[PDB]
Design a protein around this ligand. Structure first.
Ligand SMILES: Nc1ncnc2c1ncn2[C@@H]1O[C@H](COP(=O)(O)OP(=O)(O)OP(=O)(O)O)[C@@H](O)[C@H]1O
Ligand SMILES: Nc1ncnc2c1ncn2[C@@H]1O[C@H](COP(=O)(O)OP(=O)(O)O)[C@@H](O)[C@H]1O
Ligand SMILES: [Mg+2]
Ligand SMILES: [Mg+2]
Ligand SMILES: [Zn+2]
Lengths: 34, 607, 594
């Protein structure tokens, strides 16, 4: 039947997003004592 | 109007919680067992009887009938949910597809909200397939009656397969890999054709705008076995004033390779449209196949059968408009009932009718064609062919388990003469358009009709002298009747008087026995086919005695009367055929002697 | 911008329901719909004149305004059926109205169907030539959106276009069962070929059929259709939407005038014995001799009587004559006599009509690449006559199809998956000169032409006419030739010829045409006396068959039956006379025994 259209499914910006992601969540401040 | 999620619940209830007391009354969750088999890849297709759903929800069956494509997907997704429950063994990764499916599932599970595009299609979460089996309530629908109103519904039909394409792989879910990102891309397909994808819609490449160009990969994709075929109106349903009408049928999955041309099958499936514009769109239709199955009175009837002249009366009923040719009319009836094929033996009784023009040959064939259950009429296509690449059985193939009336037999093509020679030999047709000797079952009596060259028959000119057909091919026929229009003023006057009555009455002259309706005749035949009468060994002694006696007459006869073992074999067919007419499962001397009488008369026709 | 109430449509819808409310009155329409309910169809037939009787104004409104008025009427019909039975109404999405009765000026022909009738009901009469395949047409497509869990519709009605994505770009999967589809077929009508002036061009009108009206028509059917003539979107193509189709009998009737009937009756009653020969002499007066041929040709026009039997045997009443003879003999002249005289005849050559040929054919349109089953010359001559010239030059496929139509009067076709079976009962008058001229009176006529030994059997008669070089015969012919040549009209001074026209005892050809048209309706039947007599003669021919044309056979017997039937029609004698059988027998003897 030709009367339907099912939907298609599935130094880099995504890599840069990971760098921001790890930075915001994994950045450490203070020291061993603090 | 109704919530598909609610329907999804009902089927899940039904499948998980339907059972049937099987052999020995075994309460067994039939579909539940099948799901377990499917969970371990032990099944592929899941045929479903709607009457099971009717057993607890006839309304659901009705809604399935008024629309079937919807409920197929509902059940398929319903089964998709149930299967992970019923998994109990980690069966071996049969074929790359399952381990590929396992690989994707781990990747998806490695991911949380998600856009609908970043999720696998249902069609790829497969390697099981689902089909319905129509309810016994739904009477089968003639192909003519499948109108535009019934599109979208589930219908059961009967017919004869005129042609079927080879199996080929149909794509279902086209898979692609991006040029420069790890995200995999999918594309379900519904249309018979499509534009393949170019640029990946992957989030990474979409964000990166790298132009990740999709490259198709067959291994990721998922195909399905597929076939294309045409089915023709069964001869019984066709009105006399019309011709059979075709219908395309699409077959896929395990329904593939369950049909051949000339198979009198019954198909249950959805009738749906396809588009390969005025006041709306015009779209060609087809029948998506689900289930294919190759198919196969009053006391006065018994009192009539007991009558001695019963079979003679039936012979008189063969074309009562036709005056004369009574013994020939008896012979035609023998062909209609056919042999037994005891064991194997050629049950079909092929007859050829050579004679001068204007002696009711063509009319007789037309009557026989109208009378027999499976009937074909041709003149000479007749035999199979390979059209374009797809088989296409000719009239000979379509006559299977029936009769093929060939008028104008004298003007056959010599290749076709060879073809029927194969049919009379082994009842199969071989053909090779591309050097591929495809053999096809052709089990069908041949009722040939020829006319001698150069006007009427010359008695002085021998057989195969008034006619230019192979004498060996002629001798293959069980019976061969020579009809001559000798001027006999008395008999000529009789026939004319018969004709003038018909003109002055539009009716046959009244005979001793009135003719029976053709349907009633066919009912007697179908009753006659019920029997397979046997030959006692005592009869063989007398039968063989008669054979050597007539064979001696052939030696005495200066002209070779073609007496042979072939002659004996047909006599067996005639005798047991007469036994079927007698409705007695043992042949008799009367049957044997009468068969000899007709054989002698056919030889006497050569006088 | 959303309509609330239509007072006019309300009244019109009410009035139709009142008209269909035929209970206190004679009950005819209530019985009709009750029969419609029982018969399960969904298209009432209506006599327009009864609607005029109950409401002339509404009937005028219906004829002048079609699309709106019918829609109201269908509404009244659907409610009325719902009144009698709700569930049966609910089975069908809709119901339809069939018009009938006398249409005063709206009853036109394709020639006279001008553009003035646009959006007016029209009752066209004509002949179907082109037919298209049955196709299912979508009208109401139903879609489901799993993203939104939402079901939508889209009607098309009179009105990329197919919706497949939600406005949110969610996928839409169609609902085939919920959606509405209807079979749909297109055909083309033309004016009846007999009543169609040659000067005027063809005026072919398209037709659209839907629902049960789809298959109620084939090519070469004389049909009256009533429908609404509408333009199309774009100088605009125009088509007729059928509201009801009916197949008028191809027999029709010889309307003429009672004066013509009275003159015919007086002429028939004058001399019934000589009327056959008097017509025969006056049949082709320009031609000299060939008297048996003229007698035979008259029988062909008269035609026998078709006998349809209980088993469906369909012994044809048509008669078939083949003329073979040396060139420069009045063969082509004789057929043009038949064309001028025959009530319903179609000329043709060996090649036949362009593309379609003699019999029907399938034709790709090539404007849309669309199949069309197009009627050929043979089918169009159904219950008529066809005059074939250069019949020897007929093509081989036609030499195949001719066997079917000669045997059955019925051309079947399955090409391009187009199953059809067209009525083609037509007496045929073929003509073909001998090959290389100069017929040899030694071999068969087949040996001189090559008719494959079968079509000669099919032809009831076969007449040979050779240019025997008798000086006496030549004097008789040349006397006739110069007598016609020397003739001048009564008003003329032996001066000018006829003007160069810009337009195209002895009885008038038109008078002959009207007379034989009347005679064809007569249905003469056998007499036992003649039946006994002919049986003696046929057996006598079989006795005379001892010497050795084709032999006398059962084909010859029925040929004599038709000839005696034909001569019986000539005198309007409803009982076949021994004279009829007598004249046929001697005529056949001439045909086979010179
Ligand atoms: N024995 C017969 N009894 C009754 N009718 C007959 C008989 N023989 C011939 N006829 C009539 O002859 C008419 C015309 O000849 P017919 O159709 O039988 O030819 P045919 O034998 O089929 O010839 P061919 O094979 O040469 O085409 C038919 O209408 C048929 O009714
Ligand atoms: N018996 C005849 N009487 C009068 N004219 C004749 C006769 N035979 C032939 N003709 C003449 O023959 C001409 C027509 O010949 P035509 O029928 O076209 O030849 P063919 O049919 O053999 O091709 C006419 O002009 C006509 O005058
Ligand atoms: Mg025949
Ligand atoms: Mg000519
Ligand atoms: Zn990418």
């Amino acid at each position: 039947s030709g009367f339907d259209d099912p939907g298609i499914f599935y130094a880099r910006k995504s890599q840069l997003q990971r760098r921001f992601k790890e930075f915001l969540r994994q950045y450490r401040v203070g020291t061993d004592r603090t | 109007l109704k919530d598909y999620a609610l329907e999804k619940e009902k089927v899940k209830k039904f499948l998980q919680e339907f059972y049937q007391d099987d052999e020995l009354g075994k309460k067994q969750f039939k579909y539940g067992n099948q799901l377990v088999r499917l969970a371990h890849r032990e099944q592929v297709a899941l045929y479903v009887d709607l009457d099971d759903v009717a057993e607890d929800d006839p309304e659901l069956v009705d809604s399935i009938c008024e629309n079937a494509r919807r409920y197929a997907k509902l059940f398929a997704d319903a089964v998709q949910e149930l299967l992970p429950q019923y998994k109990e063994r980690e069966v071996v990764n049969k074929d790359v597809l399952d381990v590929y499916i396992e690989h994707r599932l781990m990747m998806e599970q490695r991911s949380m909200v998600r856009s609908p595009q970043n999720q696998y299609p249902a069609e790829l979460m497969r390697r099981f397939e689902l089909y319905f089996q129509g309810p016994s309530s739904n009477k089968p629908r003639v192909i003519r009656e499948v109108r535009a109103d019934s599109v979208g519904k589930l219908v059961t039909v009967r017919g004869i397969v005129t042609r079927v394409s080879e199996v080929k792989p149909k794509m279902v879910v086209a898979t692609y890999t991006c040029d420069q990102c790890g995200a995999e891309t999918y594309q379900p397909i519904q249309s018979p054709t499509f534009m393949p994808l170019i640029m990946c819609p992957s989030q990474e490449c979409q964000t990166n705008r790298s132009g990740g160009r999709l490259y198709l990969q067959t291994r990721g994709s998922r195909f399905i076995k597929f076939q294309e075929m045409k089915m023709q109106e069964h001869s019984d349903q066709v009105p006399v004033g019309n011709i059979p009408r075709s219908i395309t049928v699409l077959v896929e999955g395990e329904n593939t390779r369950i049909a051949q041309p000339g198979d009198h099958v019954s198909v249950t499936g959805i009738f749906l449209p396809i588009l390969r514009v005025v006041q709306g769109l015009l779209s060609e239709t087809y029948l998506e196949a689900h289930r294919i199955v190759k198919m196969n009175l009053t006391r006065e009837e018994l009192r009539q059968i007991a009558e001695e002249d019963f079979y003679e009366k039936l012979a008189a009923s063969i074309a009562p408009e036709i005056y004369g040719h009574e013994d020939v009319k008896k012979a035609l009836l023998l062909l209609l009932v056919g042999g037994v094929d005891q064991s194997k033996i050629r049950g079909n009784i092929n007859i050829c009718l050579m004679g001068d023009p204007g002696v009711a040959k063509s009319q007789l064939l037309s009557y026989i064609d109208r009378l027999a259950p499976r009937s074909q009429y041709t003149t000479g296509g007749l035999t199979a062919a390979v059209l374009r690449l797809t088989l296409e059985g000719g009239a000979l193939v379509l006559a299977d388990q029936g009769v093929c009336c060939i008028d104008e037999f004298d003007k056959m093509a010599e290749a076709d003469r060879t073809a029927i020679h194969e049919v009379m030999e082994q009842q199969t047709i071989s053909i090779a358009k591309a050097g591929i000797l495809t053999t096809l079952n052709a089990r069908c009596s041949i009722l040939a009709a020829a006319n001698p060259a150069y006007g009427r028959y010359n008695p002085r000119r021998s057989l195969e002298q008034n006619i230019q057909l192979p004498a060996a091919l002629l001798s293959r026929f069980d019976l061969l009747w020579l009809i001559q229009d000798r001027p006999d003023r008395d008999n000529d006057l009789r026939l004319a008087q018969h004709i003038t009555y018909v003109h002055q009455h539009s009716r046959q002259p009244p005979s001793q026995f009135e003719p029976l309706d053709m349907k009633l005749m066919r009912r007697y035949i179908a009753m006659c086919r019920e029997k397979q009468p046997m030959v006692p060994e005592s009869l063989a002694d007398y039968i063989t005695a008669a054979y050597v006696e007539m064979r001696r007459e052939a030696w005495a006869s200066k002209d070779a009367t073609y007496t042979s073992a072939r002659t004996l074999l047909a006599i067996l067919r005639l005798s047991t055929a007469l036994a079927r007419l007698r409705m007695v499962d043992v042949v008799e001397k009367e049957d044997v002697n009468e068969a000899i009488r007709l054989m002698e008369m056919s030889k006497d026709s050569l006088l | 911008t959303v309509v609330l109430d239509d007072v006019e449509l309300r009244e019109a819808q009410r009035d139709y329901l009142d008209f269909l409310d035929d209970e206190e009155d004679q009950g005819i329409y209530q019985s009709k719909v009750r029969e419609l309910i029982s018969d399960n169809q969904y298209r009432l037939i209506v006599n327009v004149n009864d609607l005029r009787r109950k409401n002339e104004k509404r009937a005028n409104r219906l004829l002048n305004n079609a699309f709106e008025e019918l829609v109201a009427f269908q509404r009244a019909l659907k409610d009325f059926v719902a009144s009698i039975d709700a569930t049966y109404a609910k089975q069908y999405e809709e119901f339809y109205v069939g018009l009938e009765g006398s249409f005063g000026s709206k009853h036109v022909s394709p020639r006279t169907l001008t553009s003035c009738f646009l959006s007016c009901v029209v009752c066209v009469e004509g002949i179907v030539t082109k037919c298209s395949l049955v196709r299912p047409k979508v009208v109401r497509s139903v879609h489901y959106c799993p993203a939104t869990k939402k079901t939508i519709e889209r009607r098309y009605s009179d009105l990329s276009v197919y919706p497949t994505k939600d406005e949110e770009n969610n996928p839409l999967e169609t609902e085939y069962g919920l959606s509405v589809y209807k079979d749909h077929q297109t055909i083309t009508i033309q004016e009846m070929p007999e009543k169609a002036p040659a000067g005027q061009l063809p005026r072919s009108v398209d037709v659209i059929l839907d629902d049960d009206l789809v298959d109620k028509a084939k090519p070469g059917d004389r049909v009256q259709v009533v429908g609404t003539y509408r333009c199309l979107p774009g100088t605009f193509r125009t088509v007729l939407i059928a509201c009801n189709v009916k197949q008028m009998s191809k027999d029709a009737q010889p309307s003429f005038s009672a004066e013509d009937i009275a003159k015919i009756k007086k002429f028939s009653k004058t001399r019934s014995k000589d009327i056959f020969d008097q017509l025969a002499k006056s049949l082709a007066p320009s031609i000299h001799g060939h008297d048996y041929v003229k007698k035979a040709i008259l029988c062909l026009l008269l035609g026998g009587v078709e006998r349809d039997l209980e088993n469906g045997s369909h012994i044809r009443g048509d008669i078939n004559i083949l003329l073979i003879g040396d060139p420069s003999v009045a063969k082509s002249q004789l057929l043009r006599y038949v064309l001028c005289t025959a009530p319903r005849a179609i000329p043709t050559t060996g090649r036949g009509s362009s593309g379609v040929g003699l019999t029907a054919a399938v034709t790709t349109d090539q404007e849309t690449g669309e199949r069309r089953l197009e009627a050929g010359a043979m089918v169009l001559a159904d219950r008529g006559v066809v005059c074939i010239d250069e019949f020897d030059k007929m093509s081989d496929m036609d030499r195949t199809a001719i066997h079917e139509v000669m045997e059955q009067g019925r051309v079947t076709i399955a090409k391009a998956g187009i199953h059809a079976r067209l009525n083609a009962r037509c007496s045929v008058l073929a003509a073909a000169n001998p090959v290389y001229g100069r017929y040899d009176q030694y071999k068969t006529p087949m040996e001189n032409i090559g008719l494959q030994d079968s079509l000669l059997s099919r032809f009831d008669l076969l007449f040979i006419m050779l240019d025997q070089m008798d000086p006496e015969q030549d004097r008789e012919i040349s006397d006739h030739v110069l007598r016609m040549h020397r003739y001048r009209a009564p008003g003329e001074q032996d001066g000018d010829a006829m003007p160069l026209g810009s337009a195209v005892k002895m009885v008038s050809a038109a008078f002959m045409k009207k007379y034989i048209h009347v005679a064809k309706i007569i249905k003469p039947v056998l007499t036992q006396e003649s039946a006994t007599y002919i049986a003696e003669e046929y057996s006598r021919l079989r006795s005379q068959d001892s010497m050795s044309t084709s032999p006398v056979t059962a084909r010859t017997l029925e040929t004599l039956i038709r000839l005696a039937t034909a001569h019986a029609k000539a005198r309007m004698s409803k009982t076949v006379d021994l004279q009829d059988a007598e004249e046929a027998v001697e005529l056949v003897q001439y045909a086979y025994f010179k």
